[PDB]
Design a protein around this ligand. Structure first.
Ligand SMILES: CCCCCCCCCCCCC/C=C/[C@H](O)[C@H](N)CO
Lengths: 41, 246, 287, 246, 41
């Protein structure tokens, strides 16, 4: 419900927050899925 | 099943017994540039089998005191192969790389190497001088060592003034002599621009640093070479002109 | 059809998570060939071993908020990117010029250098005062000079007419001046590390000073004067703060371990290497 | 798949690469005492995570001439941990044990140990005297050795006057240096009574006897420790009173 | 329900056998990975 006083959108505030995570790309960048309960090799 | 594996691209093939899985950097595959992301209007060339394939570079002999080595990828391949010729005749370049590092050793050897793909890897000058005009700058041949590669002076900071302990934040794989004899990582094309010049810019470097040193017993084989194999993958070129190698 | 060979995803996905993860009750396990503890660090994947698998845990529903750690709240804090000294009375002079670099000094530089690529807008705030800290009712002019615009050659120069270059007129006693800036790079992201050269040609191994520089980061110049026909006698200092908003970040990387010797270059002194840690007495005694 | 395994109880965990399966004694699991079998009318306490968990004792160094060792379980744990404190404040005790023995060695070492859980294991006096009043009796500290354990004088009879060859009639497992590096056995609570005092009575003993001796070659590691880990499992206590340790 | 963690067989069975066990006719086997002889003591 924010407000912008100018017609240039980059002058606005922090806009809307967001929650997004996919650590899977940093944590497990592996091409064969490793089941967490089973032996990796 | 997971240990054994075979790659193939072009007319080249690699087989491994003792390999440990495969690293796909940042969870994305190499792709051709989409129409939306494209900017330059010329029709790019896509050579495929003539360019995309495994290229093997000269081998590094790893010794008890070895400090590590590094390479720059749209460098090492500029003077070699058909990939190198397209790179000299074209102003624009895009591709990903499939990377493979290989070190054999006996079950009586011990040690560990850290293989890492570190984008926009910028080596630094070594000296205490704070004045910008007299400050040392790290040579041309130290920045782009070419096929022969360059070695670290002080690997602990990676020559970048940055701690090696945190290098695990980069797509990386260990080659541990007791576990696996090779390391494999696929890198999609990353940069702030859709295409970029191959001879000027180096997208990413590779770092093989011997974290735990090399140790063995008398009578064992002393010479332990390290060999790297790189496959330019899903390549594109554009901006054709006369050959400029430098 | 006449020739066949001419006839010819990702891995994961992002989950929206509003709060920290919970914990589910588990009990003892005794059986074979199920081992969450054993991992392989060689594969390059971090340990997926969780709490519930390792030991017995209770049922914990976690209300702790994860919001404050987003990159967009992490850079929402303003910092000092540059400070320019203006003396209108000394000799001729009359103007001050500051080429825009947010690498000027440390705290904000060290934050932004843990990512290779950043796209964002910015908000600049200009806090101006006397060398003595006092405020006096003098009017100042802040003119932004995009790349390729002619720089002011003096206090009376025609450069200051500003038919194009945006300016800010503010008196010195008034509240600070604040403006929003868009993302002006000719590329799609700022990049704090460029490995390569801006130009073609020969690259000497004696002085490489061309190396490392990325032209896409050059935003031009910020100039300041004080508006009068006669030269005022005063000394003046202008601190520049910037919020960093609407931020996106790519391919993170490690923090700087070593003190920064230079503004544009990641140089360090190799004799003084700090060994980021604190020294200790042997091992196997913790403090 | 069957080789690798991990246990967990309480806050403690054990992982094994080379383990060979698991022995469950007499085909029954440890249980709490049923209402029908119960006799004492007080409400027993069931501490769970504070008591049930793996406890590791001091390690025995196994030497070429080693004759074997033994322990008594509701003994070793009476002076250690929270399990030991409940045992001193309570007159009544019931529980089963999960037991794990661990001996590493190289593929160049050879030998075999016999791990066995032998209920109501009663050591005997050693001497030829047939008169009951002058006959020797085997000490206090030989009967209940405590955490430090005791060693056999003549393991062939198990100090019981009984042939060791027949010790396989007890829940047992071999640890063979070429096959497995550890042995694991789970023992349900057995006795003629639903509860029994922990400090007076020893339900069962453990026997690690080096059947085939320890042999290796010069240059190999000489020191070969043996370590035992025991988890009191599914415990119960009753008859609260002041602490009696003896 | 207010707290979750407070919210929480054998192996074999006995067969009645009146007489000793019988024997059933078998023949030669030649194949792989079926080995009743190899045991782990
Ligand atoms: C009235 C004055 C307004 C000034 C507006 C200028 C805004 C400049 C754009 C944001 C800053 C871009 C990021 C800076 C890049 C680096 O600091 C250097 N160029 C590289 O060393």
């Amino acid at each position: 419900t924010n407000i912008n006083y100018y017609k240039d959108s980059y002058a606005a505030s922090a806009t809307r927050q967001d929650f997004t995570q996919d650590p899977k790309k940093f944590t497990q960048p592996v091409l064969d899925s490793i089941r967490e309960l089973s032996a990796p090799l | 099943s997971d240990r054994v594996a075979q790659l193939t691209v072009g007319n080249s093939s690699i087989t491994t017994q003792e390999a440990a899985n495969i690293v796909l950097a940042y969870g994305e595959w190499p792709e051709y540039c989409p129409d939306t992301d494209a900017t330059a209007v010329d029709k790019p060339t896509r050579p495929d089998v003539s360019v995309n394939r495994f290229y093997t570079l000269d081998s590094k002999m790893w010794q008890e005191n070895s400090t590590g080595w590094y390479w720059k990828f749209p460098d090492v391949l500029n003077k070699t192969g058909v990939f190198g010729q397209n790179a000299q005749f074209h102003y624009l370049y895009r591709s990903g790389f499939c990377l493979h590092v290989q070190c054999n050793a006996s079950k009586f050897h011990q040690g560990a190497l850290l293989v890492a793909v570190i984008p926009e890897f910028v080596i630094a000058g070594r000296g205490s001088n704070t004045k910008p005009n007299e400050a040392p700058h790290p040579g041309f041949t130290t920045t782009f060592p070419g096929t022969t590669g360059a070695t670290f002076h002080d690997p602990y900071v990676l020559d970048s003034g940055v701690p090696l302990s945190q290098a695990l934040i980069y797509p990386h794989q260990w080659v541990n002599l007791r576990t696996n004899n090779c390391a494999t990582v696929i890198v999609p094309y990353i940069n702030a621009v859709p295409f970029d010049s191959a001879i000027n810019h180096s997208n990413f470097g590779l770092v093989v640093v011997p974290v735990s040193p090399l140790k063995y017993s008398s009578g064992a084989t002393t010479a332990i070479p390290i060999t790297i194999t790189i496959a330019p993958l899903n390549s594109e070129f554009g901006g054709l002109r006369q050959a400029v190698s430098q | 059809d006449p020739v066949e060979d001419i006839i010819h995803r990702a891995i994961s996905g992002a989950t929206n998570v509003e709060s920290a993860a919970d914990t589910t009750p588990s009990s003892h396990r005794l059986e074979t060939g199920r081992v969450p503890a054993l991992q392989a660090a060689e594969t390059g994947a971090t340990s997926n071993a969780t709490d519930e698998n390792m030991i017995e845990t209770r049922c914990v529903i976690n209300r702790n908020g994860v919001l404050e750690t987003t990159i967009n709240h992490f850079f929402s804090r303003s910092g000092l990117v540059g400070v320019v000294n203006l003396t209108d009375g000394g000799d001729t002079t009359g103007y001050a010029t500051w080429d825009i670099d947010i690498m000027g000094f440390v705290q904000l530089r060290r934050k932004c250098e843990m990512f290779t690529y950043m796209r964002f807008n910015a908000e600049f705030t200009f806090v101006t005062t006397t060398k003595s800290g006092e405020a006096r009712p003098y009017m100042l002019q802040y003119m932004y000079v995009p790349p390729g615009a002619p720089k002011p050659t003096g206090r009376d120069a025609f450069q200051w007419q500003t038919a194009t270059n945006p300016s800010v007129f503010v008196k010195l006693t008034d509240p600070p001046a604040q403006v929003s800036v868009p993302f002006m790079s000719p590329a799609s992201a700022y990049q704090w590390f460029y490995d390569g050269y801006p130009t073609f040609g020969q690259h000497p191994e004696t002085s490489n000073t061309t190396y490392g520089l990325c032209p896409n980061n050059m935003m031009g110049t910020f100039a300041v004067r004080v508006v009068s026909r006669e030269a005022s006698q005063l000394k003046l200092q202008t601190r520049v703060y910037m919020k960093l908003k609407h931020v996106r970040a790519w391919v993170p990387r490690p923090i700087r371990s070593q003190p920064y010797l230079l503004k544009n270059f990641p140089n360090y002194d190799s004799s003084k290497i700090t060994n980021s840690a604190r020294d200790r007495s042997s091992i196997k005694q913790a403090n």
